[PDB]
Amino acid sequence: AIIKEFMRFKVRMEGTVNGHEFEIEGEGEGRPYEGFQTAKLKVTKGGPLPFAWDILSPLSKAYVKHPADIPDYFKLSFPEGFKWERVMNYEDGGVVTVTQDSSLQDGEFIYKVKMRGTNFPSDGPVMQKKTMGWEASSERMYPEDGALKGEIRMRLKLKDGGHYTSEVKTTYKAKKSVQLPGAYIVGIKLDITSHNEDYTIVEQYERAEGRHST
């Protein structure tokens, strides 16, 4: 009963992408049982970023709407919370790795993110900043070795109508022993709703719902 119908969060990220260091702070809010949230981020160090915002945007699992019959691993993990680690392999060789800790403090989610991005080609759409947001995704979740894993083949939209693809694996682990669901899918749609000219301030909006795999 600790995850309320309406919850806020605070986040801090530090990252290095192609050698460029930076820090981001943000806050957000949403409805964890209805499966939606918004966030407002600001680049507090090392901005403007010389690369697409979209590689950062998918870097808040407590807010996925779960059917009654699929255990909500993310919510059951609280108040302790959970960690996750992720690799995102972009098709042109760019790699993003991420570690993250989510906890609950004073009735607010606290997220802490560290990430590194390497090998984004100088001429590619990330460094060229030619992406236009992610298409909707289906994250395949499944229990493996006392943790919960998610795989996603994700696609960033390109200006010219093409797509730029990243193969994503994430391991989710509760900080306390918690019951695992069976395999299932989280449908997710994230959009950037507004930003200043140089993406030093960005607002984004995500909806996510668990569902069975037929």
Numbering used by the authors: 6 to 64, 69 to 223
Task: Quote the passages of the study that discuss this structure, keeping the authors' original sentences.
Recently, three OFPs with novel phenotypes have been developed: permanently fluorescent LSSmOrange with a large Stokes shift (437 nm, 572 nm) and two proteins photoswitchable from orange to far-red fluorescent states PSmOrange ( 548 nm, 565 nm; photoconverted form 636 nm, 662 nm) and PSmOrange2 ( 546 nm, 561 nm; photoconverted form 619 nm, 651 nm). LSSmOrange and PSmOrange have been engineered from mOrange and PSmOrange2 has been engineered from PSmOrange using directed molecular evolution. Electron density maps show that LSSmOrange, PSmOrange, and PSmOrange2 have the same chromophore structures as parental mOrange. It consists of p-hydroxyphenyl, imidazolinone, and 2-hydroxy-dihydrooxazole rings.
PSmOrange could be used for multicolor photolabeling, super-resolution photoactivated localization microscopy (PALM), and tracking of the photoswitched cell population in living animals. Multiple conformations for PSmOrange were not modeled due to the relatively low (1.94 Å) resolution of the diffraction data. The key substitutions enabling PSmOrange photoconversion are Q64L and F99Y introduced in a process of molecular evolution via random and rational mutagenesis of parental mOrange. In mOrange, Q64 forms H-bonds with guanidine group of R95 and the main chain carbonyl of I60. Substitution of Q64 with Leu disables formation of these two H-bonds. The side chain carboxyl of Y99 forms new water-mediated H-bond with the main chain carbonyl of I60. These two changes result in the protein that in the presence of oxidizing agents such as potassium ferricyanide or intracellular oxidants and light could be converted into a far-red emitting form. Out of six substitutions made in mOrange to obtain PSmOrange Q64L is the only one located close enough to the chromophore to cause structural changes enabling photoconversion. SDS-PAGE and mass spectrometry results demonstrated that PSmOrange photoconversion is accompanied by a cleavage of polypeptide chain between the chromophore and F65 and by oxidation of the hydroxyl of 2-hydroxy-dihydrooxazole ring of the chromophore to carbonyl. This modification strongly affects the conjugation system of the chromophore - it enables the chromophore to recover its distorted planarity around Cα1 atom and adds C = O bond to the conjugation resulting in a substantial (∼90 nm) bathochromic shift of photoconverted PSmOrange absorbance/emission bands.
